[model samples]
Target: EFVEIGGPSEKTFKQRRTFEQRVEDVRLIREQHPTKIPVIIERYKGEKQLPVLDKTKFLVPDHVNMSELIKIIRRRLQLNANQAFFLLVNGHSMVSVSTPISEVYESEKDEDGFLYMVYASQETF
Candidate 1:
């Protein structure tokens, strides 16, 4: 067996951007595009909940925000008073309204070019 030199520890790693040199690259993308993205909507199983769509797949604009999608889902489901619905993104936390739908799809979509979302009511928890 050969002897090895000392290895660097985690704290010794250096980063390209400096806190002084480059900082605020956190602006959101809000521009709308021509083509639409496809999302595969699924239902969280429950007894009293309304059934998922006959066709679970939907095509939406790239710039569609979470709030707009919420309304669309509500109308499609014909939700009544106090029927709380929650939307879950690819295996992560609930989506924020300000973020573009494409942003979610970009990070979370599979090689199939489809994003998966889950719609569940309070009772479905």
Candidate 2:
């Protein structure tokens, strides 16, 4: 039987952690893993078709392409071939799939030093 993963928590990462704490956390993370980009992926609140992901925190390689990351998320959600998935940065805009993770991070990393992305599935009309 298929089971749906629970949605994101009521409080976001930023809400749960103090600004100073988050900054320090990112500092240590980067110091230890210089090549990895700290990322947080959350499902869109209005989404109904896609199942929530079991994990949200990700450490993506700097050289990884955005398309590769999207593919990974799609597989994790077990979406069908016909289903459409959208990934937006900062709950506002989509980055180019061909862009490298480093570039995306440089442009979109939040004040807390984590790259934030929101995923949603849509139906084609």
Candidate 3:
């Protein structure tokens, strides 16, 4: 009789899950049903803000990179190069321009799937 050592190794102890089950699991935990996820961009100390739309909640796609977000901000505010500003997440001004919106939202979003960030004109002290 062959001796069973440690039942099954963790690497080989894989659960038998179907493909559809895996897909459903991912869908359940997905940030959004579609490409759009909710985001809120505010200003610091009376700085420029997002467009004055009917509502404050914004539905932005995860594909949006920081560079794209910055351009959108500039276009929305019609800010020239001289009117440049900075962005913040979780009150920290350390967002990378190459970071994707989805990654940020997934890590920093609230229970309601809302990611709140701040934008402020370059510090002028």
Q: Top model by TM-score, which number?
A: 2
Give me candidate 1's TM-score against the actual structure: 0.63
Poorly placed runs, candidate 3 (over 4 Å): 1-33, 46-55, 94-97, 123-125
Stretches off by above 4 angstroms in model 2 are 1-9, 91-95, 123-125
lDDT of 1 by residue, 1-125 (tens): 99988886322001333433222211111123236776767676452575566656577888888889988887788888678777877555554647888788778764445566777775235
Off by over 4 Å in 1: 1-34, 95-97, 123-125
Clashing pairs in 1: none
lDDT of 3 at 63: 91
Ranking of all candidate structures by their lDDT, best first: 2, 1, 3
Worst-scoring 10-residue span by lDDT in model 3: 9-18
The local distance difference test score of each candidate is 0.63, 0.83, 0.60
lDDT of 3 by residue, 54-77 (tens): 323466777988778777776776
